[PDB]
Structures are given as structure tokens and as C-alpha cells.
Fold proteinase inhibitor.
Amino acid sequence: DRIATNCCAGTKGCKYFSDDGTFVCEGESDPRNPKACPRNADPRIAYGICPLA
């Protein structure tokens, strides 16, 4: 479904794409380094293909 987020807030591995159909970015939420950006949402972030396993 549709998800409001950004490259930084996005879950690692999950690849978010825009409404335009172009690949935007995968979540850079690497577990090795502490990071969290739930204080912004990219307008082109329409949906993201998150890994099930």
C-alpha cells in the first residue's frame, strides 16, 4: 500500500518507489548505525516494497 516516509526513515531493504513509477530509494535504516528520521516525509514516496523475510 501507500507509505509516507523517506530514505532515512525507510526500513532497511525496503525499496520505496514514487507514484511516477521510478525507484526512489531503499530504507537506509542500517542496524549497525543508530538512525531514525520520523520527522519528515518525501512527497514522491508513494509506496515501498518491504521484505517479508
In short: The beta strands are 15-17, 23-26, 47-49.
